[PDB]
Amino acid sequence: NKITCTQDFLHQYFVTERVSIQFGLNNKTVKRINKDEFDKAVNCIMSWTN
Amino acid sequence: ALEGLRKKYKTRQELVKALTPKRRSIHLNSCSNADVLAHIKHFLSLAANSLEQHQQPISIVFQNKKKHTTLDFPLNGPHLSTHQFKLKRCAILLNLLKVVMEKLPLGKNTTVRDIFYSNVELFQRQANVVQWLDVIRFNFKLSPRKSLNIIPAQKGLVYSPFPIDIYDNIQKQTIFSGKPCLIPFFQDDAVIKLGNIVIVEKEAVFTKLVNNYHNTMLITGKGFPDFLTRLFLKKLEQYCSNLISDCSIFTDADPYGISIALNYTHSNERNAYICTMANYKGIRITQVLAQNNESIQLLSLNQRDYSLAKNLIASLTANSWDIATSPLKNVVIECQREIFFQKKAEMNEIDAGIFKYK
Amino acid sequence: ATANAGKAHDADIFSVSACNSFTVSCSGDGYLKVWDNKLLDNENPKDKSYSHFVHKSGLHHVDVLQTIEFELCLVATTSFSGDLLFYRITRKVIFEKLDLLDSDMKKHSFWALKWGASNSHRLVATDVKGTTYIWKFHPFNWSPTLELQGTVESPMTPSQFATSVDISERGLIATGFNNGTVQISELSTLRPLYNFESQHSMINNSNSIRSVKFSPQGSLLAIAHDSNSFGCITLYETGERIGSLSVPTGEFAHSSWVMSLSFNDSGETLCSAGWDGKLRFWDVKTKERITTLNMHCDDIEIEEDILAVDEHGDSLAEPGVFDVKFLKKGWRSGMGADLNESLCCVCLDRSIRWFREA
Amino acid sequence: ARDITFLTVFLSAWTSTVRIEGPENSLYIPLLLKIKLNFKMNQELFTKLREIVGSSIRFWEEQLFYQVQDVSTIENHVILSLKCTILTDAQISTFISKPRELHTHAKGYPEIYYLSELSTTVNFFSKEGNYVEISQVIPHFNEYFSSLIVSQLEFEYPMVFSMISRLRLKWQQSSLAPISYALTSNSVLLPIMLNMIAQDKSSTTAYQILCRRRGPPIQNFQIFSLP
DNA sequence: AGCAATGTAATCGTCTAGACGATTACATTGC
Ligand SMILES: [Mg+2]
């Protein structure tokens, strides 16, 4: 099987988000990315540099 | 695996309570040896087979002293509280429930101290055993004192110049004349026979009177009196009041002595068995400053000696109004006097003939 | 020398005050017993006891305030649980309890109390821990109000009992303590000018401070303490020692603690109230005894008004004195009202006896 | 030879792997446990990455209660030799091995499997290419090695990568033998109770955020913190 | 040493989701 995301479950349910100082589990920088869009993006990145 | 727990249940609540392991909440309750034996065996067997075959997380639930606590086995409370070492209370409960099994059929009572010393590395304290005994005693509608063959350890000690004779239909024990021994143990039925009362504390002044001994009997529970000493005093009074006379507690001037004396004198509104002869002729602060006209005896009050002295002023004067006439008038006035004077006396160093009439 | 108000209260009188109209005196049995100052020729003050129940815990301190320049008079009193209980005594007599403090602040046990007259009326009161608050009166349609303006924290750690206090004219809040260290502050600065201590350089003991009184001018400062079995008074001129008033035999002024003392109107005499029962009058120049007022319970043959036996059975032929006060000229009424200056006293046998010499 | 390889969650594109040495109601137990973190990136980059990897000793020693031994690099990897502090060989024997052979009958005991290797294959794709930026990968070393713990490694292996479950086990393992010794005058129920403690779901991180939350400061989860 | 009380710490209800605050809990005084 595959893992979810720590924030996907954290955002599907209604958590008041103030657990950043307590649980430290809220990192806003990046989220779950679909495999197809990520693959096409990295392919484009490699193709640009050549 | 979340594939089946996240995409099918879609609620913040209604999930932490539904997808919770099936707990078999078991009640401790369901006046004879066979009845309690059978009920405790049923508890033990129903817990054991549930753990073994069905694999059921047990949830022990019981009642506590009325002014509810549930001891779940795999600490399955979804709230990791810092104060959560709850399996050391459950393993003492289930261990005492085994000693009860091992001691009931023999019909010979065993003290709390022996039970503690059998498994000291587990119970870790003789107070814990008593605390958990006074819970399974209540949850079984049994008297805390007349109970499932577990007895106190005879703290209180009595000096008497005449052989008193207890009579318990457990057969009779016998306190002997002139031998500072412990008060004999007996159940709540004995007809005490004689063949005056001066109660003390700390065992130090008591030992001094035993050494001196210049017909006065010297009952003395060592700190704050135990149940055995209070039962001894009560039954002694109610069976030989026409012999004995002038019961007198003797404590020092600290706002602790005034509580040790209060233990003999009167308990709360639920005060079943207390010695009612407690004419508290204690060593007051106006009795030391009068003999101080023959390391100072007078010690200034700290923040514990006083905080507890003004707590017997707020407590005593709660329902009764008239201070002019009351059995606690003497206690209240002496309690206010220490707070005003800021200095408490002692009885260890000021021993004299005041204890006797002459 | 004046009509003794024997058997005033029935538990224990603990203080007294004077208001040129009133002679308010708290006691242990909950209620004040204000006595009208002006009699006519012989009327006993017993029928003038205008009692009013205040708090059932008890009372230890009391102080009054008279402003005549329309005739607002107040009476403050602290209880044995710790509470300011201002009572605006109007005029027959009505005891309207006043509430000038919020319940939020009322969390600590106030102990001492003393009023400060306006030259801006001020009142201060020490806590049991050692804190010393300083209020300020704004009576000014009618709403008396007590407003805080400072608090001189006890520098010591751990803190002591904080027995006494003063609000001297020019401003020096001599907060006495349970072992020397008489804190000295300023009424308009709240910055401790000095921090005194017990000049005794003997072994470590508990020499408490019972009273701290100033001079009407504002120069002298009487200090009354005890060497744990005697009474001594040492002046702290504004600690800086001027001398130790005592009597020849050692270094003691009384055979027991000097419980209270007060200055005079001209500041030329220092009356003393000792547990030894005498009232030895000192002087600020000669430092010698003037007169002795021994007390005994044989003034009246009839036993119904005099008290000679305590609650337990001992003989109070040697009554202690908890508080005495001085009355200005034209305060008391009777013979020698203007040519003589009167003083009142409070004894152990619960008998307020106003006094007059020559 | 059953093996489990978690699917590649594209947070950058990386993977995982749990190697087990068992015979095929189960109880998973740490070996005696090496956590491999080979990057497989097609400079000082390896030095700083090893620094971040070794910056998690505070986590492994204050949350999961482990004991690091080596941070050795076998020519490609940043492996961490981890020895369990709670599930020591003495406890591993005492709790389960003795009744598993002493009480030989149709008991129903859980068959204990094992696990040694956790080979992660985090493969970053930097936007600028070969060059990287420091402190930019903390919310990439913290949103994978926390998501994997939250999702499955606390459910299907609650004894080796579970914070609160291991905390409860080390809290209540002292009174685990005398609670059955007083229940059946034996030690038969030790493996069943140890399996039930792992099977408990009310001690995973999923059911711990969603509560009344009486105590804030626990489960820091900010692993691989930059020095 | 068998019983007890003080002090504060932690959690549990209400009332403004956290807080505070007004309540019980058990550790550390004590005789
Ligand atoms: Mg004592």
The three state secondary structure string of C113-131 is CEEECCCCCEEEEEECCCC
Find residue C258's DSSP bridge partners: C274
Nearest C-alpha in B relative to D186: B48
B308 nearest nucleotide via C1' and CA: E6
Which positions in chain A touch D148 (Cβ < 8 Å)?
A: 3
The angle formed by the CA atoms of residues C255, C125 and C37, to the nearest 5 degrees, is: 70
**Residues present in chain D in total:** 227
* Phi and psi torsions of C273, nearest 5°: -125, 110
Annotated binding residue at B246? no
Distance, in angstroms, between D79 CA and closest chain B CA?
26
Discontinuities in chain A with C to N beyond 2.5 Å fall right after none
Which positions in chain A touch D210 (Cβ < 8 Å)?
A: 13, 15
Whether the Cβ atoms of residue B344 and residue C18 lie closer than 8 Å to each other: no
Query: For residue C304, what is the DSSP state?
Result: T
Residue-by-residue DSSP string for B215-262: --B--B-SSSPPHHHHHHHHHHHHHHTTT----EE---SSTTHHHHHH
Take residue B80 and report the two structure tokens written for it.
């990791």
C1' (E24) to CA (A11) span, angstroms: 36
Peptide bond preceding C158 in cis form (omega within 30 of 0): yes
The number of folded domains in chain A is 1
Whether the Cβ atoms of residue C252 and residue C232 lie closer than 8 Å to each other: yes
Amino acid at D5: T
Please identify every residue of B annotated as catalytic. Answer: 117
SS3 content of chain D, % helix, strand, coil (to 5): 30, 15, 55
Whether the Cβ atoms of residue D83 and residue D33 lie closer than 8 Å to each other: yes
Whether the Cβ atoms of residue C206 and residue B299 lie closer than 8 Å to each other: yes
Alpha-carbon span D116 to D30, nearest angstrom? 7
**Which subunits sit against D, judged by 3+ Cβ pairs under 8 A?**
A, B
The domain segmentation of chain B, as residue ranges, is 24-151, 157-344
Which positions in chain B touch D210 (Cβ < 8 Å)?
A: 12-13, 15-16, 78
Element (H, E) at A46: helix A35-49
Whether the Cβ atoms of residue D37 and residue D50 lie closer than 8 Å to each other: no
Take residue C41 and report the two structure tokens written for it.
């020729």
Within a domain: residue A1? Answer: no
Annotated binding residue at B14? no
3-state SS string for B252-287:
CCCCCHHHHHHHHHCCCCCCCCCCCCCCCCCCCHHH
What count of other Cβ atoms lies within 10 Å of the Cβ of residue C225?
A: 26
Alpha-carbon span D120 to D137, nearest angstrom? 15
SS3 content of chain C, % helix, strand, coil (to 5): 0, 30, 70
* Ligand 1 midpoint to CA C254 (Å): 29
Amino acid at B189: D
* Ligand 1 midpoint to CA B205 (Å): 11
Cβ–Cβ of A2/B12 closer than 8 Å? no
Alpha-carbon span B318 to B320, nearest angstrom? 6
Chain D contact present for A43, CB below 8 A: no
Whether the Cβ atoms of residue B285 and residue B338 lie closer than 8 Å to each other: yes
Query: For residue D110, what is the DSSP state?
Result: P
Alpha-carbon span D10 to C275, nearest angstrom? 90
Alpha-carbon span B264 to B348, nearest angstrom? 20
Chain D contact present for B59, CB below 8 A: no
Alpha-carbon span B314 to B331, nearest angstrom? 12
How many angstroms separate the first and last alpha carbons of chain A?
A: 35
Alpha-carbon span D148 to A8, nearest angstrom? 12
Q: HSE-up of D203 (CA within 13 Å, CB side)?
A: 26
SS3 content of chain A, % helix, strand, coil (to 5): 50, 0, 50
Query: Which of these, C63, C84, C88, lies nearest to C74 by C-alpha position?
Result: C88
Range list of β-strands (E), D69-202: 80-84, 111-115, 117-119
Beta-carbon contacts of B315 under 8 Å, excluding residues fewer than 6 positions away, are none
Amino acid at D3: D
Find residue D172's DSSP bridge partners: none
- Residue A15's domain comprises 6-49
Alpha-carbon span B229 to B250, nearest angstrom? 15
How many angstroms separate the first and last alpha carbons of chain B?
A: 87
| Topology given in CATH for the domain delimited by B157-344 | Dna Topoisomerase Vi A Subunit; Chain: A, domain 2 (3.40.1360)
Q: Where are the alpha helices (DSSP H) in D147-205?
A: 147-148, 163-172, 178-181, 190-199
The angle formed by the CA atoms of residues D28, D29 and D30, to the nearest 5 degrees, is: 135
Query: For residue D89, what is the DSSP state?
Result: H
Find residue C32's DSSP bridge partners: C52
Within a domain: residue D219? Answer: no
Query: Which of these, C66, C156, C167, C75, lies nearest to C126 by C-alpha position?
Result: C167
Of the candidates B1, B6, B11, the beta carbon closest to that of A9 is on B6
Which positions in chain B touch C158 (Cβ < 8 Å)?
A: 303
Whether the Cβ atoms of residue B192 and residue B236 lie closer than 8 Å to each other: yes
C-alpha C34: how far from its chain's center?
Answer: 15
The number of folded domains in chain C is 1
Distance, in angstroms, between B6 CA and closest chain A CA?
8
A16 nearest nucleotide via C1' and CA: E17
The residue whose two tokens read 């600590």 is: C108
Pairing of strands D26-30, D111-115: parallel
Whether the Cβ atoms of residue B50 and residue B58 lie closer than 8 Å to each other: yes
Whether the Cβ atoms of residue B132 and residue B97 lie closer than 8 Å to each other: no
What SS3 class is residue B66? Answer: coil
Q: What separation in angstroms does the CA of C55 have from each of B150, B249, C97, C348?
A: 48, 30, 11, 21
Q: How many helices (H) and strands (E) does chain A have?
A: 2, 0
Alpha-carbon span B293 to B282, nearest angstrom? 20
Chain B contact present for A23, CB below 8 A: no
Whether the Cβ atoms of residue C344 and residue C20 lie closer than 8 Å to each other: no
Query: Which of these, C338, C321, C304, C170, lies nearest to C259 by C-alpha position?
Result: C321
Query: Which nucleotides in chain E lie less than 7 Å from some protein C-beta?
Result: 1-7, 10-12, 17-18, 24-26, 29-31
Residue-by-residue DSSP string for B19-50: SS---EEEES----HHHHHHHHHHHHHHHHHI
* Ligand 1 midpoint to CA C130 (Å): 26
Take residue C117 and report the two structure tokens written for it.
């007259």
Q: What separation in angstroms does the CA of B107 have from each of B34, B147, B148, B166?
A: 11, 12, 9, 21
Chain B contact present for A6, CB below 8 A: no
What SS3 class is residue C255? Answer: coil
**Residues present in chain C in total:** 358
Chain A contact present for B12, CB below 8 A: yes
Distance, in angstroms, between B1 CA and closest chain A CA?
7
Q: What is the CATH number of the domain that holds C184?
A: 2.130.10.10
B77 nearest nucleotide via C1' and CA: E11
Whether the Cβ atoms of residue C146 and residue C123 lie closer than 8 Å to each other: yes
Alpha-carbon span C52 to D77, nearest angstrom? 89
* Ligand 1 midpoint to CA B357 (Å): 22
Residues with CB under 5 A from ligand 1 (ion): B 252, 254, 257
What count of other Cβ atoms lies within 10 Å of the Cβ of residue C218?
A: 14
Cβ–Cβ of A24/D222 closer than 8 Å? yes
What count of other Cβ atoms lies within 10 Å of the Cβ of residue B66?
A: 5
Query: For residue D96, what is the DSSP state?
Result: I
- Residue C347's domain comprises 1-358
Amino acid at B273: Y
Take residue C209 and report the two structure tokens written for it.
């401070």
Beta-carbon contacts of B67 under 8 Å, excluding residues fewer than 6 positions away, are none
Whether the Cβ atoms of residue C11 and residue C28 lie closer than 8 Å to each other: yes
Chain A contact present for D124, CB below 8 A: no
Alpha-carbon span D13 to A39, nearest angstrom? 9
Query: For residue C336, what is the DSSP state?
Result: T
Take residue C37 and report the two structure tokens written for it.
């100052």
Alpha-carbon span B300 to B343, nearest angstrom? 4
Query: Which of these, B232, B259, B254, B251, lies nearest to B306 by C-alpha position?
Result: B254
Take residue C64 and report the two structure tokens written for it.
């009054």
What count of other Cβ atoms lies within 10 Å of the Cβ of residue C90?
A: 12
Query: For residue C351, what is the DSSP state?
Result: E
Beta-carbon contacts of D177 under 8 Å, excluding residues fewer than 6 positions away, are D94, D187, D190
Find residue D10's DSSP bridge partners: D13
The number of folded domains in chain D is 1
* Phi and psi torsions of D51, nearest 5°: -60, -45
Chain A contact present for B2, CB below 8 A: yes
Which positions in chain B touch D218 (Cβ < 8 Å)?
A: 80
Amino acid at B138: F
Instruction: Give the burial class of B133: count Cβ atoms within 10 A of its Cβ; 0-12 exposed, 13-18 middle, 19 or more buried.
Output: buried
Four-CA torsion D112, D117, D118, D120, nearest 10 degrees: -150
Whether the Cβ atoms of residue D211 and residue B78 lie closer than 8 Å to each other: yes
Query: Which of these, B226, B248, B252, B249, lies nearest to B305 by C-alpha position?
Result: B252
The angle formed by the CA atoms of residues C138, C142 and C144, to the nearest 5 degrees, is: 35
What SS3 class is residue B131? Answer: helix
Residue-by-residue DSSP string for B155-207: --EE-BSS--B--------BPPBT--EEPPP--TT---B---BEE-STTHHHH
A17 nearest nucleotide via C1' and CA: E17
Pairing of strands C351-353, D26-30: unpaired
CB pairs under 8 A between B and C: 74
Sheet hosting strand C321-326, strand order edge to edge: C4-6, C351-353, C343-347, C321-326
How many angstroms separate the first and last alpha carbons of chain C?
A: 9
Q: What is the resolution of this structure in A?
A: 3.3
The residue whose two tokens read 């805080």 is: C148
What SS3 class is residue D64? Answer: coil
Residue-by-residue DSSP string for B83-123: S---HHHHHHHHHHHHHHHHHTTTT--EEHHHHHHHTHHHH
Within a domain: residue A31? Answer: yes
Buried b (16+ CB within 10 A) or exposed e, D48-68: ebeebbebbeebbeebbbbee
Beta-carbon contacts of C18 under 8 Å, excluding residues fewer than 6 positions away, are C37, C64, C325, C326, C327, C331, C344
What count of other Cβ atoms lies within 10 Å of the Cβ of residue B221?
A: 25
Whether the Cβ atoms of residue C49 and residue C344 lie closer than 8 Å to each other: no
C-alpha D169: how far from its chain's center?
Answer: 14
Element (H, E) at D192: helix D190-199
The residue whose two tokens read 């939350």 is: D213
- Residue D34's domain comprises 26-209
